[PDB]
Amino acid sequence: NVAHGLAWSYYIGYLRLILPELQARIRTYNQHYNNLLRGAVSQRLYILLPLDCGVPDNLSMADPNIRFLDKLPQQTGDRAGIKDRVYSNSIYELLENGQRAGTCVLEYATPLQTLFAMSQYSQAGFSREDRLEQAKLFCRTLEDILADAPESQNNCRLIAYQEPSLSQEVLRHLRQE
């Protein structure tokens, strides 16, 4: 349904184009930019998938243990008539007991915002109960696309969750690899 088109739109428009050349940006940020004494940013992009489609624009305010650190060197590409369209990513630190536990490139999945707004708009004809299924369907279709993909070899880890600690949730995924 709607999530299927958004899931493919996510892969074709963003993931297919930044995942193949994300490791090099992380290498550049670790070697030439990262504080000489603050460890290394992980090699994988971690994508948050809140099934309730609650996607705040600032990660830091969604969890005190998560706070912005830096941005990777931005990626530019001529896209659909725009010269040097800028694809940017933000590096975040994860705090356990007040000490930095993990550093990674973390972001939400923006198509989930689009689903949330469509449920809020009258002309979209989208219901709140419809949203919760489309949120799950979006994650499924995204998983299927990345399962056979020449860009998500070891570049992309999905983080889905339903709320009855996000920092502990993300940390859980980093330590599994």
Next chain:
Amino acid sequence: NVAHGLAWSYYIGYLRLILPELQARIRTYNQHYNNLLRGAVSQRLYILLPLDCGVPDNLSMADPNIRFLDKLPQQTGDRAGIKDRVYSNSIYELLENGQRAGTCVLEYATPLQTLFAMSQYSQAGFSREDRLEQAKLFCRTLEDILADAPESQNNCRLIAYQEPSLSQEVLRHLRQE
């Protein structure tokens, strides 16, 4: 169908967020940046909508009479966990008889690329004959959304066309206003 979700995704993710503050960027580009002797960039964003979903990434190579001139001051905004996500636009000149006839902010509608790719991917389950309808449906739903919209007051002009001169086609729209 798929186009409906992409059409709303286009409005909610891009148009709702740059149209309200596009005129000011054009003013800044005309007053503080534009060559003192090259006229003024139009106040409206013109969006190309090729119904065949053929969307080249460089406008200049799609028509010799269209050629890149400059970029507007980029718009930044914290979006879905990305700090200072950059929304950029490119200014193009239109050539009639080899002399500059019009200058405007011109770009393709990227969701049409997404539709084209989905028709090319096996797992998407999207057909080429399905595409041509979804291309039309995408334009219709976009028109409906902008018809009652507090951001497309006089900010956005859609340019749809089917190929049996793009520069003459775009020029035709500028002179109607």
